[PDB]
Amino acid sequence: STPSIVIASAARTAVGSFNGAFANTPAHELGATVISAVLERAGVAAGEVNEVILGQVLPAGEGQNPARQAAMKAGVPQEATAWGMNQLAGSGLRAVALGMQQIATGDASIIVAGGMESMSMAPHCAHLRGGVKMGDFKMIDTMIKDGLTDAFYGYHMGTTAENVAKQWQLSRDEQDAFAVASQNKAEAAQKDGRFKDEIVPFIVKGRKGDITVDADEYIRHGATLDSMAKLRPAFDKEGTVTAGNASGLNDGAAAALLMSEAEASRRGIQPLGRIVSWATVGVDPKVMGTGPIPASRKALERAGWKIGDLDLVEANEAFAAQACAVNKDLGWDPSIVNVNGGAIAIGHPIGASGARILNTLLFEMKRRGARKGLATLCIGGGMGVAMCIESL
Amino acid sequence: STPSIVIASAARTAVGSFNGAFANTPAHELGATVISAVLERAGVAAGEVNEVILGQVLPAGEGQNPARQAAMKAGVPQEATAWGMNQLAGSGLRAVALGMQQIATGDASIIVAGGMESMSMAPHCAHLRGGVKMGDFKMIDTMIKDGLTDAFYGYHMGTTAENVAKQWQLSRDEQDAFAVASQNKAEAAQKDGRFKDEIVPFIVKGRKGDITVDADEYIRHGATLDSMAKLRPAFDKEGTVTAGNASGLNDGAAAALLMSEAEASRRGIQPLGRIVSWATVGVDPKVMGTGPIPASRKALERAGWKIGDLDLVEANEAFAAQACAVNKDLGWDPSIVNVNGGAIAIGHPIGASGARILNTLLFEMKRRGARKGLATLCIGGGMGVAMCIESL
Amino acid sequence: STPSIVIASAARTAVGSFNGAFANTPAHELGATVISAVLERAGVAAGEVNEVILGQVLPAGEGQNPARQAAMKAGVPQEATAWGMNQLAGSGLRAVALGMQQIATGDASIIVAGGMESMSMAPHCAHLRGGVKMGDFKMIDTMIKDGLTDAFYGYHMGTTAENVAKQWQLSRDEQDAFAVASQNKAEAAQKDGRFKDEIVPFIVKGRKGDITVDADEYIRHGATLDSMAKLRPAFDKEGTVTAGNASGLNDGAAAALLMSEAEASRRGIQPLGRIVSWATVGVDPKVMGTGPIPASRKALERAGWKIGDLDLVEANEAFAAQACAVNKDLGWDPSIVNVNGGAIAIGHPIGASGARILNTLLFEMKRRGARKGLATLCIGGGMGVAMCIESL
Amino acid sequence: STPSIVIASAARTAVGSFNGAFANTPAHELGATVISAVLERAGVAAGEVNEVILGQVLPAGEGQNPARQAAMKAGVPQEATAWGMNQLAGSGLRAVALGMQQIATGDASIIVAGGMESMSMAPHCAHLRGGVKMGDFKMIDTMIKDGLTDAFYGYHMGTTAENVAKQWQLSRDEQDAFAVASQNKAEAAQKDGRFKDEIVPFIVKGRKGDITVDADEYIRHGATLDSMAKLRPAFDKEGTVTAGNASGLNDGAAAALLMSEAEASRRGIQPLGRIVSWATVGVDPKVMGTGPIPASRKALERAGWKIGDLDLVEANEAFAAQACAVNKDLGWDPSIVNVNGGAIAIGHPIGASGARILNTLLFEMKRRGARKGLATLCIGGGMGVAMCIESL
């Protein structure tokens, strides 16, 4: 009689480009559309929700507890609760596991969990309370400081990617091929309509017109190898990691509605999947992109699955270098990984990404009739997170 | 059979005044000292820790995931994990409940949970990406915007307190009396040595000398009713809420180390208590200070306890108005509530407070041999969280 | 033996739109281009310049005495001197008068004088030395604060324009019909090449391509009365002044090479004119747009001239309201006023505008063979300035 | 015959220390007390003033034309005119020459001229119209950027003083000797009452106290060669210039009232002095402190004087190295130079400094009965200004 929790429904916004479609859209407005969507898609009313849990790395200047803001905007009643959390890129996936645990421990029946992020709306800051008697001082980009810079070594996440490139002897040609493939896979899936089911359209309100956004705008159409080859290294001058083989700076939100297996049955819901297991593990910050290796092995151990039992995998592509290292070590068939493309093409709204790649996994598992899936991401500061999903 | 999680050990720093002892100390440095302390106090080595979970409302400018920063500084190995979370004032207590759930679901054996906050070090900010083509703009105090302003009604938490004062007909004289009592209780507890056990001293590293902080600096000695009566209302010009009958802006951290009851017995630890129940519930943001009412009632229901069964209560004092409302409604003997004073005297380091009052409750239950306790806080945006503890 | 000073040569950059052509070009660079221009137009070498005087209203963040930076870039030797001044919109024509005085008093042989302005490059500022212990503070737009806001009445210069409109009972249709006439006059002069002689090209240095600017970008092509009548009142919500019948925010520079009449004759220079008189006078800041009325009448009195003796006038069109009032009062033939259009069309780079209109007058006076001319402008704070010029 | 222009009256505020006495006083409020005081000391009515001309280097944020703001607050009517100018530390003296020229050309009868400066009220700024798309940026100290950094070689003025000390072979013992002796002369003069006449008290409007300032606060009492010699270099790590032998950051205003000699005779005003000549010359920027050398020679040649003729001199001490070198090259008796101390002691309110020293020169010339005086300053960017005075 071990607790069994299902994902009844899921949805994500399109991922916007940096200072692009969602340039002036607070993360909680994206989150509120995603909440509304999961509820509609499951046939569950906002009144029934007990808690909303949203990963978010960059909430500065957005006001008190943006998760509660997103819940309230979506009509979740004042009697429910809401909170935010931060395990960097792991957050939007880890929030799902956190939601599962509220149900498993008997503290809630119905949870909406995911993540949301507006990198565009992240402010610049400075600690000014003591005062600057005289001289210049720095206004810090909170996106770079709080999101992308390692706190122990003082360098960008891209440098950890270089470290991984060096350790696994990953050529600039291998990384570029990977990146072009991600773009081409993503472009094909977009064109074929494979992101329609997962995406809920977002209405960006405007004085001189509302704009509906329902397409992933960061995916480059007709990306060429030559384009990638011409780029300068972004983080080391004799490096291999570029703006082209790294993911970008992006905005979006994504979520899942969770409840027990027996609850879904009473309601007659056909869930998108059952949460079979999850794990999170640390690694050295210097090679943080390696996190998915110990996390995915641990999740699989917990599920009682072999790597070869998986039918589909979403492994987040923060950088080609790390995505390549993860596939090499794990040895899973690359043909079942990121089948509709990855973050290099789609983008990386940090605190939402974990939920974004769960959406992609779940709606692809449904479409192809895949029985077993895994979602995993690397995490700045040296962690990984993984979740195993089975179809009902 | 139902998991049973204990609190093996706890510690807090002293609570620093705004721009006082800890004016330039990042929250994660406070956190690291508390993690070190819980480990030392339980006889558990840092290598044994699976995860650190730290509430924190105001991390802007602090760099990537200050929870991980705190853990690493404390010697928790890279293979462990760490994350932060934000349910505002509820955070440092909610983190404990969340850590108890990691154990209950079999994902972890040993958790360090609590919170940390440096309101002093919170920066000013502005979104500057799209530019400011023309016209003035605000550099926003993130402490006020993200910590203390209601996101729905646009006013400060102190206005919610006013809303509560009016609905419950709480006079200025009653609120001031409650405030002077909190000061006087805290001063007496301090002088008698009652905060020694819970406090771990913090070494503020300087250049012209190191300074050890082990006393709660915000407590006013010899606080007079006359000094309370002379202050002007701080949020409504015909109001009743003042700087004197509200808590303050403060820095500190606090934590507990958690493990199963069976694991404590194996190690021969005498735990500070067993987590018997917890709960979180929403209320209207306009009267957010009333959150402890439904949360405490729900926590008690889940424990199987009557209000009368409690021997000791820590009910956080964000404002005299709400504290007095909570006490009236619940009807618990005020002589068992906040016996060593509350936050009006001690301070309100937002994301650490829930774990700070847990520390106070635990060490006082131990001191006086009390069997059943309850800790509870109000939460901006209209929530409450409560936890029930029993002696072992 | 009265001194007699001539404008040997003159030149201006073209006028840039707010954040357009010259969006990132420092004032002194524009200034340097115009200094080189007047030197080379006169056939005078920069080593022969004694002193450069540049009006400039918004110099903040451009570093030490930008008049010295424009001089020194332009190849004026270190042994010369250089300074800036601020009589607001008066500055650029006042600087010409001040140079005339250096020559009349025996202190200099040869002056370059004019003004420069980059309203684009004006920063935002805040006083921050005390430092801000808590609370939002304002980042002040120095363009609006130091350029456009009355320091006595607190409101914009366009509010002083409403005051003049109401006094003189200037309707919305009379203001719009003057606005459209100014745009049409200017697109005609532009199309006919009448701005070629006065405009010196400016090269905007770039990474992906140098850009040559030699045409006024703020002039609207095909300006209709209907487009003008669609606009909303910009300053008073049931007012008459709009974005269409006021000038805008602009960048540019303008100067003149000044020397004694006898010096020009030595050097074979055929001067654009002789400065016959000038005057500056004050009025009420509330109706500063009336400024040109006493200053133009004082200048004419000093020249021993009657208003009917003028063949050409340049009267700056800060607002259609004040420009209509000045014309109405003085009663000069509107067919000789701003014949190539005015500032509503050309733009209003404040501290340069007085040298800008001086350029347009001198060159058209050469073109049609006019003998007698007058330039005048209003001045925030309640002043006017005027100059009379005669052809040689 | 030649126009003879006299200084009817002069007044100055005491000099304030950075963030001290006048820490939150706008410059124009200081300017207005000196304008009102020049009128009172002369017995001339404010209505009879044609124009106010004020030097000011650092007006960012202060509002439209602070010279006008000064003039209107002083009770000069709206009919008159006002403007500011910037030759950096030459401005306060240059504004006097400019007022002199207004009268010599016949465009005005009565002028108030000087300089004003609030270095304390000078803001931080950044250009943010285009926005900052990503990355950290600098908020610039306008006091440093616009007041004290060379636009050409990018270093502090205290490095151009280091350059004069390597060229003139000036030791660190020679510069300490000049700075002790300056404080001694200044402190002895202050307690002597020799500054009383020239100073006009300023009322700093508080809220819990009006405070009257009539003493130069920056002057240190009992200044020895030891605390001079115990400071480390300020601009070069192996350098000679220190906080002790540089002047400082300061606030203040100063002005003189100008009219013709014949007009002073009509008004029964016994003038402080007649202006006989002035001059401004440029020098290599790298060694700007040499300005006062060519500028005083020229002023002296225009007057038809020999250097031996001077019975008193004010040579501004911006630095000890620049001042010792001007005393070296010109060869005038050091006993008559800065006899009541100088700016190392007194302070250096940039745009007001030239008017400041003109005040001390004039009031001391009257006391001691000296006929021929000279005032001069070095200017950033490489200039000197100087004016020759003769008491009648």
- DSSP assignment of D31-69 equals HHHHHHHHHHHHT--GGG--EEEEE-S--TTS-S-HHHH
Closest-CA residue of A relative to D23 is A133
Gap between the Cα atoms of D335 and D313, Å rounded: 9
Cα distance from D188 to chain C (closest Cα, Å)? Answer: 32
Is B4 at the interface with chain A, CB within 8 A?
no
User: How far from each other are the two terminal CA atoms of chain A, in whole angstroms?
Assistant: 17
Give the rounded distance of the alpha carbon of D175 from its chain centre.
21
Distance CA D252, CA D195 (A): 14
Q: Which amino acid is at A183?
A: Q
| Beta carbons of B352 and B88 less than 8 angstroms apart | no
Closest CA to D113 of D352, D277, D363: D352
Q: Which domains does chain C have, with CATH numbers?
A: 4-124+194-275 (3.40.47.10), 152-193+276-389 (3.40.47.10)
> Touching check for D145 and chain C: CB below 8 Å?
yes
Please, what is the end-to-end C-alpha distance for chain D in angstroms? 18
Contacts of B18 in chain C (CB under 8 A): 134
User: Which chain C positions have a beta carbon within 8 Å of A128's beta carbon?
Assistant: 128, 131-132
The b/e string for A282-303 (b: 16+ C-beta within 10 A; e otherwise) is bbebbbbbbbbbbbbbbbbebb
Name subunits touching C (3+ CB pairs < 8 A): A, B, D
Contacts of D242 (CB under 8 A, 6+ apart): D228, D231, D232, D233, D234
C131 touches chain B (CB under 8 A): no
Max Cα distance, chain A (Å): 68
Chain B nearest CA to A226, separation (Å): 31
CA torsion angle for D184, D188, D189, D192 (degrees, to 10)? 180
β-strand pairing of B111-118 with B51-55: parallel
d(CA C280, CA C147): 19
Q: After which residues is chain A broken (C to N over 2.5 A)?
A: none
Q: How far apart are CA D318 and CA A317, in angstroms?
A: 60
Nearest residue to A250 (alpha-carbon basis) of A188, A343, A181, A115 = A343
Going B264 to B265 to B268 to B269, the CA torsion angle's sign is positive
Question: B141 at the C interface (CB within 8 A)?
Answer: yes
Alpha-carbon radius of gyration of chain D: 20
Alpha helices by DSSP H, listed for B258-383, are 261-267, 292-303, 320-330, 343-346, 353-368
| Beta strand ranges found along D193-333 (DSSP E) | 202-204, 211-213, 250-260, 273-282, 312-315
Q: Taken in order C160, C166, C169, C173, is the CA torsion positive or negative?
A: positive
CA nearest neighbour of C240 among C306, C319, C300: C319
Alpha-helical runs (H) found in chain A: 27-42, 66-73, 91-104, 142-147, 157-167, 172-192, 225-229, 261-267, 292-303, 320-330, 343-346, 350-368
Q: How far is D332 from chain C (nearest CA, A)?
A: 24
What is the distance between the alpha carbons of residues C182 and C338, in angstroms, rounded to a whole number?
8
User: Do the Cβ atoms of A83 and B85 come within 8 Å?
Assistant: yes
CA B309 from chain centre, in angstroms, equals 24
Sequence-distant (≥ 6) Cβ neighbours of residue A230 within 8 angstroms: none
Name the method of structure determination: X-ray
Query: Is the separation of the CB atoms in B330 and B299 below 8 Å?
Result: no
Task: Please name the amino acid found at residue D262.
Answer: A
Among C206, A86, A225, A180, which Cα is nearest to B60's?
A86
Among residues B116, B14, B39, the alpha carbon closest in space to that of B355 is found at: B116
- Whose structure tokens read 């009919």? D79
- Between D24, D105, D146, which is nearest C59 by CB? D146
Q: Do C86 and D84 lie within an 8 Å CB cutoff?
A: yes
Distance from CA of A197 to the nearest CA of B (A): 31
- Of D285, D321, D315, whose CA–CA distance to D376 is shortest? D315
- CA dihedral of B356, B361, B367, B372, whole degrees rounded to 10: -160
Question: Distance (Å, rounded) from C-alpha A326 to C-alpha A304?
Answer: 20
Helix (H, G, I), strand (E, B) or coil at A104: helix
Query: Between β-strands D137-141 and C312-315, what pairing exists: parallel, antiparallel or unpaired?
Result: unpaired
Chain A interface includes C126 (CB < 8 A): no
H or E element that contains B6: strand B5-12
CB–CB contact C139 B140 (8 Å): no
Resolution (A): 1.7
Burial A158-183 (b: 16+ CB within 10 A, else e): bbbbbbbbeebebebebbbbbbbbbb
Q: How far is D309 from chain B (nearest CA, A)?
A: 56
Distance (Å, rounded) from C-alpha C152 to C-alpha A294? Answer: 69
The SS3 of residue D187 is helix
Round to whole Å and give the CA distance between D70 and C292.
23
User: D129 and chain B: CB distance < 8 Å anywhere?
Assistant: yes
Cα angle: B255, vertex B54, A147; to 5 degrees: 155
CA D51 to chain centroid, in Å, comes to 20
Spatial CA neighbour of D88 closest among D341, D262, D335, D318: D318
Q: Which residue from A129, A133, A134 is facing C132, i.e. has the nearest CB?
A: A129
> Token match 């669609």: residue?
C230
Q: Which residues of C touch A130 (CB under 8 A)?
A: 131
Contact between A23 and A206 under an 8 Å Cβ cutoff? The reply is no
Q: A-chain residues within 8 Å CB-CB of D249?
A: 134
The whole-angstrom separation of Cα D341 and Cα A271 is 88
Q: Flag if D129 and C23 touch (Cβ within 8 Å).
A: yes
**Cβ contact, residue pair B146, A19, below 8 Å:** no
Provide the CA B44 distance to its chain's centre, in angstroms.
24
D118 touches chain C (CB under 8 A): no
Using the Cβ of A225 and the Cβ atoms of chain D, whether some distance falls under 8 Å is answered with no
The reply to whether residue B141 touches residue C126, judged by beta carbons under 8 angstroms, is no
End-to-end CA distance of chain B: 18
Residues of D in contact with A132 (CB under 8 A): 124, 141
Q: Any CB–CB contact under 8 A between A135 and chain D?
A: yes
Q: Is D51 an interface residue toward C (CB < 8 Å)?
A: yes
Q: What letter would DSSP give residue D384?
A: E
Residues before each break in chain C (C–N > 2.5 Å)?
none
Chain B touching partners, 3 or more CB pairs below 8 A: A, C, D
Q: Which residues of B fall within a CB distance of 8 Å from D133?
A: 129
Question: Within chain C, how many helices (H) and strands (E) appear?
Answer: 12, 14
- Residues in chain D with CB shorter than 8 Å from the CB of B134 are 129
Report yes or no: B286 and B30 within 8 Å, Cβ to Cβ.
no
Strand C5-12 and strand B383-390: the pairing is: unpaired
Secondary structure class of B229 (helix, strand, coil)? helix
CA A259 vs CA A275, A387, D182: distances in Å: 11, 16, 83
Closest listed residue to residue B64, CA positions, set D286, D148, A142: A142
Q: Retrieve residue B296's tokens.
A: 């405490």
CA distances from residue A384 to B80, B95, C122, D77 in whole angstroms, order as listed: 10, 21, 47, 74
Q: Are strands C372-379 and C81-86 parallel, antiparallel or unpaired?
A: unpaired
D258 burial via Cβ count (<10 Å: 0-12, 13-18, 19+)? buried
Does the beta-carbon distance from A134 to C130 stay under 8 Å? no
Q: How many other C-beta atoms are found inside a 10 Å radius of the C-beta of residue B203?
A: 12
How is chain D split among helix, strand and coil, in percent rounded to 5? 40, 25, 40
Residues with Cβ within 8 Å of D363's Cβ and at least 6 positions away in sequence, in order, are D10, D197, D198, D272
